[PDB]
């Protein structure tokens, strides 16, 4: 859709669950298109700046996650096609990871980048 | 398993290239001329050519036809062997972490190893820890 493409290249971030790369206006107006019932990041800026960070790199144009070699390697085949990232550094605080396990969402470390 | 092709782009226009081809795909997925591409890879460590996912070489030629950023590398489409689908996604150590060690680019303490103290959430400025090397206004006039 037209909402998952970031409009402007300035002030864009990436989430730590689905690595959704968008602009700061879409994460606040619309939020995470791949998780809205567990994260609820539409309607504020503290939750957008808490889970989603700017420290990320690498950009991919995911279009057919059901048939592509890159989507299975990043475990993003059960997500919506759009702008994604390949290494989103950081970690969630011990304030939102405890509720994700009780609801059935296994928070995985999307950081496939190596350390030294 | 889909193949990966390498196309040539303008130096300085990698992210603009990706954000333009994504909007072409969304602008033609419902017409009689769709796009056969799966994804386009654009690493941040490269500067000059990008990567694209398609099964055959005719699909990249019939998809990138009409773009002015990809008119130079339009006559030739190299192919990588299968063991190179993995080294493209590797990133060596974003680059924003407190209590870390960064250096300067401009100003007076050029190429001087410093430390980060606090990060501003506005993504405008950043706190740095350096040591002053001025004369305390004794030698200069
Ligand atoms: Zn996510």
From Swiss-Prot, chain A:
Binding-site positions, Zn(2+): 15, 18, 32, 35
Zinc finger regions, C4-type: 15-35
Name the chain's protein. Answer: Transcription elongation factor SPT4
Similarity comment? Belongs to the SPT4 family.
- A Pfam match: Spt4
Using the UniProt annotation, give all residue ranges assigned to the region (Interaction with SUPT5H): 1-39
Which UniProt keywords are listed? Answer: Acetylation, Activator, Metal-binding, Nucleus, Repressor, Transcription, Transcription regulation, Ubl conjugation, Zinc, Zinc-finger
Q: How is it modified after translation?
A: Ubiquitinated by UBR5 when not assembled in the DSIF complex, leading to its degradation: UBR5 recognizes and binds a degron that is not accessible when SUPT4H1 is part of the DSIF complex.
Q: Name one GO molecular function term.
A: RNA polymerase II complex binding
UniProt source species: Macaca fascicularis (Crab-eating macaque)
What is known about its subunit structure? Interacts with SUPT5H to form DSIF. DSIF interacts with the positive transcription elongation factor b complex (P-TEFb complex), which is composed of CDK9 and cyclin-T (CCNT1 or CCNT2). DSIF interacts with RNA polymerase II, and this interaction is reduced by phosphorylation of the C-terminal domain (CTD) of POLR2A by P-TEFb. DSIF also interacts with the NELF complex, which is composed of NELFA, NELFB, NELFD and NELFE, and this interaction occurs following prior binding of DSIF to RNA polymerase II.
Subcellular location as annotated = Nucleus
Q: Where N-acetylalanine occurs along the chain?
A: 1
**A cellular component annotation (GO) from this entry:** DSIF complex
InterPro entries reported for this sequence: RPABC4/Spt4, Spt4, Spt4/RpoE2_Znf, Spt4_sf
Q: What is its main location?
A: nucleus
**One of the GO biological process terms:** transcription elongation-coupled chromatin remodeling
Task: Please indicate if the UniProt record lists Secreted as a keyword.
Answer: no
Q: What does this protein do?
A: Component of the DRB sensitivity-inducing factor complex (DSIF complex), which regulates mRNA processing and transcription elongation by RNA polymerase II. DSIF positively regulates mRNA capping by stimulating the mRNA guanylyltransferase activity of RNGTT/CAP1A. DSIF also acts cooperatively with the negative elongation factor complex (NELF complex) to enhance transcriptional pausing at sites proximal to the promoter. Transcriptional pausing may facilitate the assembly of an elongation competent RNA polymerase II complex.
Curated annotation (Swiss-Prot), chain B:
Q: Where is this region: Interaction with SUPT4H1?
A: 1-93
UniProt domain KOW: residue ranges:
96-129
Q: Could you identify this protein by its name?
A: Transcription elongation factor SPT5
The UniProt subunit note reads as follows:
Interacts with SUPT4H1 to form DSIF. DSIF interacts with the positive transcription elongation factor b complex (P-TEFb complex), which is composed of CDK9 and cyclin-T (CCNT1 or CCNT2). DSIF interacts with RNA polymerase II (Pol II); forms DNA and RNA clamps that stabilize Pol II elongation complex while maintaining the nontemplate DNA strand in the transcription bubble and nascent RNA in the exit channel. This interaction is reduced by phosphorylation of the C-terminal domain (CTD) of POLR2A by P-TEFb.
Record's function text = Component of the DRB sensitivity-inducing factor complex (DSIF complex), which regulates mRNA processing and transcription elongation by RNA polymerase II. DSIF positively regulates mRNA capping by stimulating the mRNA guanylyltransferase activity of RNGTT/CAP1A. DSIF also acts cooperatively with the negative elongation factor complex (NELF complex) to enhance transcriptional pausing at sites proximal to the promoter. Transcriptional pausing may facilitate the assembly of an elongation competent RNA polymerase II complex.
Protein source organism: Homo sapiens (Human)
According to UniProt, the tissues expressing it are described as: Ubiquitously expressed.
Q: How this protein is processed and modified after translation, per its record?
A: Methylated by PRMT1/HRMT1L2 and PRMT5/SKB1. Methylation negatively regulates interaction with P-TEFb and RNA polymerase II.
> What's the gene?
SUPT5H
Stretch of the intact protein here:
176 to 318 of 1087
Q: Which family does it belong to?
A: Belongs to the SPT5 family.
Superkingdom, natural source: Eukaryota
| Location(s) in or outside the cell | Nucleus
Phenotype upon changing residue 71 to A: Reduces the affinity for Pol II elongation complex
């Amino acid at each position: 859709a037209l909402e998952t493409v970031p409009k402007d290249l300035r002030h864009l971030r990436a989430c730590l669950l689905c690595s959704l790369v968008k602009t700061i206006d879409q994460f606040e107006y619309d939020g995470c298109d791949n998780c809205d019932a567990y994260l609820q990041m539409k309607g504020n800026r503290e939750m957008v700046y808490d889970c989603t960070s700017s420290s990320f790199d690498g950009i991919i144009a995911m279009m057919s996650p059901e048939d592509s070699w890159v989507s299975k390697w990043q475990r993003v085949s059960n997500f919506k096609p759009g702008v994604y990232a390949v290494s989103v550094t950081g970690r969630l605080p011990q304030g939102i990871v405890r509720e994700l396990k009780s609801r059935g969402v296994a928070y995985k470390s999307r950081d496939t980048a190596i350390k030294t | 398993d889909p193949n990966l092709w390498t196309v040539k782009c303008k130096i300085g226009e990698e992210r603009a290239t990706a954000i333009s081809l994504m909007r072409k795909f969304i602008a033609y997925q419902f017409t009689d001329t769709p796009l056969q591409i799966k994804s386009v890879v654009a690493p941040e460590h490269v500067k000059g050519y990008i990567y694209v996912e398609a099964y055959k070489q005719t699909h990249v030629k019939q998809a990138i036809e009409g773009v002015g950023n990809l008119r130079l590398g339009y006559w030739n489409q190299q192919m990588v062997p299968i063991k190179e689908m993995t080294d493209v996604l590797k990133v060596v150590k974003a680059n924003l972490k407190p209590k870390s060690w960064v250096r300067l680019k401009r100003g007076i303490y050029k190429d001087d190893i410093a430390q980060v103290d606090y990060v501003e959430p506005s993504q405008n400025t950043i706190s740095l820890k350096m040591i002053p090397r001025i004369d305390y206004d004794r030698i200069k006039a």
